[PDB]
Amino acid sequence: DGKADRMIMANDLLNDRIKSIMCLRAKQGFSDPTPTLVDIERTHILLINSHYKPFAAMGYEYQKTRPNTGNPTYNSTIQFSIPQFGDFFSDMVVHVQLAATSASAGTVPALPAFIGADDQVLTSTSVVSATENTTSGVYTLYTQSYVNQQGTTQTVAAAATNFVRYCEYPGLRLFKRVKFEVNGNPLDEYTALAAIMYNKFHVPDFKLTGWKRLIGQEVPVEAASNLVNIASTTPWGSPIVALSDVNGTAVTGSPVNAAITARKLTQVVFGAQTPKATQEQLNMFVPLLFWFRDPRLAIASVSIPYGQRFITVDIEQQSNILFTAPGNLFLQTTVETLLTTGAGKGTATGVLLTQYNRYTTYTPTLASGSSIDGTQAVQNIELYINNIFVTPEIHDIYIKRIGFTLIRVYREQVQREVNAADQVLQSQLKWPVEFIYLGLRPANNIAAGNTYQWRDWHHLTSVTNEPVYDVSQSYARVSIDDTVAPVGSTTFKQSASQVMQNQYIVPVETETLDTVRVKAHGIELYAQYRAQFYRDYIPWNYGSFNLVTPQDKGALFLNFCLYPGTYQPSGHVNISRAREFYIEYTSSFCDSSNPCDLISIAKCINFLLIS
Amino acid sequence: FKLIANDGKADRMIMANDLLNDRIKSIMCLRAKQGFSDPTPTLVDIERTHILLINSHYKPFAAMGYEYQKTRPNTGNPTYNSTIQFSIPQFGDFFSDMVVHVQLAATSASAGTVPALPAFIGADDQVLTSTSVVSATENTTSGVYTLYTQSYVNQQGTTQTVAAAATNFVRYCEYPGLRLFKRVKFEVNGNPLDEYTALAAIMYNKFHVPDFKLTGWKRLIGQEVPVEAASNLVNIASTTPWGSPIVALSDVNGTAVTGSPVNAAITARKLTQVVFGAQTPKATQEQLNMFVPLLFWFRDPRLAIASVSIPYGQRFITVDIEQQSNILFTAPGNLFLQTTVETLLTTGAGKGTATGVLLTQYNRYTTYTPTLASGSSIDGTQAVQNIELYINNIFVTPEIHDIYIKRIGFTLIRVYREQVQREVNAADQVLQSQLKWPVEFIYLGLRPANNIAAGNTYQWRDWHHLTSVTNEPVYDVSQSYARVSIDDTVAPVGSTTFKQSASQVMQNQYIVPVETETLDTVRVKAHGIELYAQYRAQFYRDYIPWNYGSFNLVTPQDKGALFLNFCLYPGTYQPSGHVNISRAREFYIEYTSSFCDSSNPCDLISIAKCINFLLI
Amino acid sequence: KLIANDGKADRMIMANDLLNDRIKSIMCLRAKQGFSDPTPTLVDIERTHILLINSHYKPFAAMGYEYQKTRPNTGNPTYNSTIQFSIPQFGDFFSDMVVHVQLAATSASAGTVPALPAFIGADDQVLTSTSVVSATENTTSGVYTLYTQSYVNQQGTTQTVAAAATNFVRYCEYPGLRLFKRVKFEVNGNPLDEYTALAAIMYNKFHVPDFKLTGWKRLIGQEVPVEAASNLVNIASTTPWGSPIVALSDVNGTAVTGSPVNAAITARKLTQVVFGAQTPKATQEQLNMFVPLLFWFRDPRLAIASVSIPYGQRFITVDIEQQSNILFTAPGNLFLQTTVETLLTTGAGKGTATGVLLTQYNRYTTYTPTLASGSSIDGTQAVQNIELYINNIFVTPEIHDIYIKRIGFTLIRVYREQVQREVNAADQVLQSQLKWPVEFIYLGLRPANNIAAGNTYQWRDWHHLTSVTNEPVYDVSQSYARVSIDDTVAPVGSTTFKQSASQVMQNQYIVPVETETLDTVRVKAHGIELYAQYRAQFYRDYIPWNYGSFNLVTPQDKGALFLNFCLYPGTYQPSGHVNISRAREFYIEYTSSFCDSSNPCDLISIAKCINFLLIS
Fold first, then answer.
1. Is C145 in CB contact (< 8 Å) with chain B?
2. Could you say which of 3.30.2350.10, 3.30.420.40, 3.40.50.2300, 2.70.9.10 is the CATH number of the domain covering B62-116+163-226+275-335+371-408?
3. I want to staple C176 with a disulfide (CB 3.0 to 4.6 A). Which of B9, C36, C291, C591 is the partner?
């Protein structure tokens, strides 16, 4: 007790209910006066309770189906029949098999143009130029050449082959258009734009690895290094470890022994998106994202019979799925500086060399005339259908008594934009709207000329590439006269080098939407709010484990229900307003020089009759 | 496939198809004799015993719609270190989730100077200029002459002059939106209906943000998100970056040589993670935009607060704003201390000194340390450019609203109750005097006082940690070697004309935040009666958040975050256990510490979520 | 402006014209029936419509829980033994269980530095106690190739052969999962339920989402990554590259490909480090684990009535793995230095050790961690403590006697495991362990070498269900150096302009590359196809993705397959099963590209079956 506990557990009420029921049962002549669990549960909940209810008998089995449209190819329409098997059919997934493929043989391209104006030489293996400076005595030499990973110089016009890679998420872009046909008319359909909105919003981490494996995305692999820290020792030489100045203070910049024993982890990827000489056979199981994937919403076969039900997949072109990438061929850019102090200093004939410096980078380079194989075959494509069976007695009752089923459908509109601000009528909305995926994707993300299209195609922002360099630094000193003391002498030579150890590319996102406003039949559904309200807050607050806060900085969620993703309706936009629906945007990026696509994918409510 | 509905005892208990078919036979026979035209049963008839796993049924909801609304403060121009009060406008029939948009101006550090150079290291040949400090240690017994050089450079390596211009970078503390709200208060009629501090905001950060909400959560409160970056190919199948002379060697006995690299088997590239947001030091931190959610109970739509139930005269959201000195910090910019040690091994006359002849071996060691510029601090004039309260307003039909007010009676609510007790004891029993309602659970921690100290150069990071964090360096070192013959007429092998040179240069340095836990054991006692026996802190940090809560309870990353649980479903609305106070008068949390003493004071932080009731 | 009644669409989703009619009716009946208040009841509305704003809850039959820890009946615990706990009489019910295991801090015994490797070259062979040197002459090219191998510590100091050296120690991955060979819940001498480490690793792969992973790893003694940030690598408007190569343009004005430019952003790198039980250390700290017991009655709803399983005949029995499968030797602070030097001379005796005019020098240096001879694990490492923690649930006496007299029975889930060793590339394996309805089956074909003592990666591969090979990734430091040895002749184009270059291994990573052992799987029971022959990715990737929601995690292990037969794996409510008639003649058929007589594998099949438990 007391007051707080009477309202949370009501244990004095519960006991009085027990005393009352046991007496009424004794009054009425029951052999066993002890109450029923149901009688207790009419007011109180039983936290420990192993009760369950039997389910009407039901089992499921998957089935595989080849298409009606002959041998599968890229850039073609593939249609499946939905065979007659179970009383209902439910979740679907399509196995796509793409042949192992390599690029055709090419050549080592021509060397770059001269950099320096002096001492210009061009051979089959290098291009050399120089800049003189007689004032400072520094002679700068530029050398550029092609090498492989081992550093062996490659000859111009000799053999060289590009690698091949897939775009990111090839399973999502391959199905250009997925549609469910019932009696000629599309019952529901979606595009790759709806598939990547699912990719951003509806794949939590406990499903992410398999999702990636399902649609052909490579999965990172964690790799452990040697020990980098070992307690009570150091990799640094003794002369720089644990120094103190003349005052007894520990020296800033003097390393001390490690306090822990630790090793590094790093992640490597070597899948379909990593360029390879041969991309081995790619097997994807692309799920079809239809409402009836939920078992409860399985579609009765009698209400949509065989012969009038089809799955139709439009297949993208190979040029948007498979790309070339640099192979074992690199451009080595090397700068050498020779500071001389004697006669002819700053030129090739200068004497008295005191300081030498070398700077060397490596850039992966494409081979000339090495392209993807246009004969790569779609080796297999098959539709997997989950078929649900029930007893004849319950099927009869269910078909006569269910009436209808609520369904959800995709409604998509793409609007090419060159305005920094615009009010775009959403003319595709027939039905009540639960929520809307919004995006302003730059046209350059899907441009053939964009060398990073394999990556940018699904991003909803303008992406720029920022290099991050690993640099190896070296120093060397040498005495060239054994009779002169080195310290303070020009016989004590200096040498240094900066060599590129590796290079990363950081994708830097520039958002294309600043503010979004929603107006419908003269009614403000959303005031002009920053894009971060729809990308961060709304996916964070709503949806529970069914709505993921998107990684993409350009993915916006226009919510109109309380529980997006759940079957029970919880809010929508009335059809009257949906028929005059406007999305007003503000952009810092879109203009006449930067076209962008206002992508809006709505999820609408619709009914479906039975029997 | 054939369905088998009745196979023995197991199927009879799980599906009960014989009974289901008997119920159908009975129901169709009764309906037929009672005069119905359609004897087939209703779906409810079947649902009274059996569940239908295929079922498209749903219920219509009482008509409902919602719309957000911006609201500005009653307290004028917003500033750091101030109290900001919002009115809760009269708009919807109910109001639910709330979020505050905060806009912090772009800011830079003031102009400063390159500080003075470090003191001499060696006792010999001391020279100090405006650009370097040089000293040396002689050793004529070994013939090794050690030269110490320290100087200031930028990233490109150009030497910077002492007292020349230099400017520090600026950074925001980690999770600045969580620290910015010193206190958040929802008050009606002068008294706080519920309130919480930044300690509750970080308790939420550790226990209630799973990964499918994290990226958006980090963006809402100003924490930078890592960005994955891909490298060049590091392994290419059938080749190697190692030079031929060392690749694929065998010894004289035919065995492959240990340490001889072979060709790669796969073609792989590396992934690295980079950050460049509010927590990364920058010359100019761009304008910071945050949408801080208010972690109140009524964020749940089911618990939306009826507008007529609270007068408009005295209903407010009141937020105390942290000071700028706890949110924005200076950090080293494009300025680095270069520490170089050089050893020269000579063998002739004067060996070990600067005049020794015949140099046989040379070594160079060099590190770089980011350095603060003198007199370059944060801009104190940084403006809080905008702050606005977003309130979700829910609208219902007039009929349901009138029914709801007259029939709801009350609502069950959850509130925060905070207590912080300063400790210098390794073990103590702390009476929890702010705990006074049915408590579902208690967040517990023992945060060292140094984590929030202005003297801690890592306060921007340590402030929300509940442990003692020390910084262990990890070094990336570039090793180089070189040999050169200075006499073209003498064979190099075995001659002192075959010189030696080597170098170790710091490529990069990482900082490993090493947590030393402050709690060894925890005990929960109420009136000389154990609610929790003395268990290791790892029982409350790892096991309880692992077993309970489902997706509502996240196993905390912080090694010091503990969860004292008293219910079966910590995240759900339905009550499932509590400790009432009630006889909880003498509620004690007893701890043991291997860290807390007179030299390392800590704050025992205990935040409980309690059940209370609001009458509508 | 709410609408509520816009067309047929709003009629079927909200049914507001129907609800208004129900309210208007209910008010008139109550008015006609003489009620004081005619406004309807929330239950009256909810008979048709769902209320999205509803603070309703039900009171729970009073309950509370408390944990209790007990010691084994079998005295001091050791490796390779059976430990048995009694379940003490405490609460009305007992629920989740977790076992605290404490393993003493441990280190390897003292050993020696092993013998140096054999000669590589055929010429100029020298064997020291500190290095082994050989060479390969080449008079045609003028290249003298010198091979040197030695032993060093991390700092690089040379270690003498047969001098002192000690190995480090490491724990296998997921030690808490392998430590328990078998875990038994025993009643009346009969095993009521039991599982092995194989079931534990199946749970580790399929039922630990990311919001529970950190705590899960800490419970079973797996080290947790620690994120560490570096110095700024990019700084806006500057570069680490020296100016001679920065922002170059060719003679035509075009920017030079390969010429770096200033950075556009300012960024740090994030790397991850581990330093726990799996990282080799001179001394591993005292390992403390709280290993949960993965029985069905962990669910609070499914707590076991203390009366229904009497005291004195109920036990938890745990078989403990041998020490040699839990704790392993790993290389310590001893490294094999492999150095190749090439000397390009052109004068008399070129290509031999007597070459004169040295033009180019190259050094290639790798390091390989090396085991010390005679340094092994401490076989006297004690199990310092092991205790079983049991949650005890207390309920009111009135509800206790009612529930025990009325619940009848409870559904339980039990493990049923079979391991079939295979050398056949394809086989059809009868599952004799299956006797009861099966919800789903964890499947794998684990290579026998993953648990073989001869495998030096057994500490890692034991829980993997594929064949793992080790692919090195090398971080290589490249350096160049040029020096003029004659100050009277111009360096350019002269043999006095000497060249030197070095490649030194900076670090090396091991990539675990998984080779799948299962190609296709087919499920055939009672001559009936429940699963056709489908690729292994259907069971590994598609099924865990589609089913189970947050209760079924997609497995990272490429060899983990999930054969599902219910709609909702992870829920207590039954949702489908394989019936007993078919379960008694049950076949799992596989095809393999890996398994043959040179690579024996174990087909591991662990099914979750449904059984029942009577009450008392």
1. yes
2. 2.70.9.10
3. C291
